[PDB]
């Protein structure tokens, strides 16, 4: 009872869900390549333009685009799916896998926070793989809800004397600026559940409310499960879960990290990067 | 070395300056009436979109708009200049006068609040009085650091289960949708001010830094100057000069406060409205 419009068929050959919310694989006509196609009901606009500007191996890139009865995205096609179906109920990742894909995470969201974008809503739905395999590239996804940066009214507003200025605003300062340290306390949450196979704020077999374990910062340590999990990994796990946002440990000072100072892992990532861009690889000036 | 745009040449005859910054006074060349021409140097979009959708006595009317090397905002012409002018220097305004003025602002940032706008740049400069008359009407002007309301990027994020969400989120949460206060605290600034004749926070004559007598909402208070004030006016200021932005009283609070009850001051503001009306009165139905 829905047909996909006459210029999105024009170029794509539309076939099976990959995952309803809906995204369709579709096949490129004139390369013959599989696609993934983004279908939104009718802030799209600001997702495209994020999408267009951002050149980074673990971002997500956006191929074509069909404003319609609906709105269509054409992405590039991630075999492997999301993150989210490996750590699923009670589901855990090898410790070296967990590193292999949070390298790529903290390398893909310092990237956005360099060029001024935060993500805020990094999950394990929004992680997606490149293939099947467990050694794979990882690419972040949903820039739905991202934020442009800049503290610019509060900027606009301290070039005055505040006279008329109310004390709220003057106390907003002294936090001002520490917005993209939400996707760090995210990734954080990720490392958790990679790790563990279960969430750290849970409303199960517990009393305390969500809201108040995440206020206190109080997160569920099993140690049964943990003792397979190194002191490195969980160390950083700590330094991410800090409910003050100006104390949170940065993308830099994660990476920065003894636990992410892994040459194997670094070596992997390097030749899953290099196998991925060989098929694309211009003869260069030597 | 610049001239105005044929467009707004072709209906205005250009002519004194009413204040730089500029406002230069115009005459509607199909009427022959005088009315005041905004020039901004190149927001604008938003403010001309504010100030076409909000029609109240006590609001500044936007009557045309030019688009050209810079914006041209034609607005009615408020003969009796900025409020600024009555209070700059020690000039203080009797307590009939203060009350009369600061009625139509409660009544103007009422209605911006109603209609979800926030001022968010009120002071002296920024009210205007229709005549050369003490007993006169005032318009509330300069909507460019106006806000649109809606806490919709937290609604939208609440709608979820926080498992991901950082704890600073959940915190500001019980202050979210509090930002009209800002107003309530400026009109305090103000009032302060009209009454006394002197700014409540400053660097003359003291010790600790504007924004330490702010944030601890320590107002300077002068008994010799106020001894000649009603304690029913210096109770409303203490009211609205409150730093806790849930404690702060509202438009509403303030209108329902005792100092407000007067119906000579609501009868006057009542006898120029009707005076001004009377002009553009078409005969009704009865
Ligand atoms: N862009 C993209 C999305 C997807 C996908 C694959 C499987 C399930 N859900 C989503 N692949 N590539
Ligand atoms: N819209 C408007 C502005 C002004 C004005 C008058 C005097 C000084 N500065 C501004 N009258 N009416
Ligand atoms: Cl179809
Ligand atoms: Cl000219």
């Given at each position: ?33 599989k696609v993934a196609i983004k279908i939104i009901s009718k802030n799209v606009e600001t997702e495209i333009e994020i999408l267009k500007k951002l050149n980074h191996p673990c971002i997500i ?226």
């Open positions: 009872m829905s047909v996909y419009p006459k210029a999105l068929r024009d170029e794509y050959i539309m076939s099976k869900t990959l995952g309803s919310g809906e995204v369709k694989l579709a096949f490129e006509r004139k390369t013959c390549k890139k956006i191929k074509n685009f069909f404003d319609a009865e609906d709105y269509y995205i054409v992405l590039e096609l991630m075999e492997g799916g999301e993150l989210f179906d490996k750590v699923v109920g009670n589901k855990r990742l090898k410790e070296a896998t967990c590193k292999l894909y949070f390298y790529q995470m903290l390398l893909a969201v310092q990237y956005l926070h360099e060029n001024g974008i935060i993500h805020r809503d990094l999950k394990p739905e929004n992680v997606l793989l490149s293939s099947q395999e467990e050694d794979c590239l990882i690419k972040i996804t949903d820039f739905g809800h991202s934020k442009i940066l800049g503290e610019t009214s509060l900027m606009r507003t301290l070039c005055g004397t505040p006279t008329y200025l109310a004390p709220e605003v003057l106390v907003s300062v002294g936090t001002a600026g520490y917005n993209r340290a939400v996707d760090c306390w995210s990734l954080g949450v990720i490392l958790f559940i990679c790790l563990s196979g279960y969430p750290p704020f849970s409303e199960h077999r517990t009393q305390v409310s969500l809201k108040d374990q995440i206020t206190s910062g109080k997160y569920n340590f099993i140690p049964e499960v943990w003792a397979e999990v190194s002191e490195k990994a969980l160390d950083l796990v700590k330094k991410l879960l800090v409910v003050d946002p100006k104390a949170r440990f940065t993308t830099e000072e994660a990476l920065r990290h003894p636990w992410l100072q892994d040459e194997d892992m670094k070596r992997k990532f390097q030749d899953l990067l290099s196998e991925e861009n060989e098929s694309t690889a211009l003869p260069q000036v030597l």
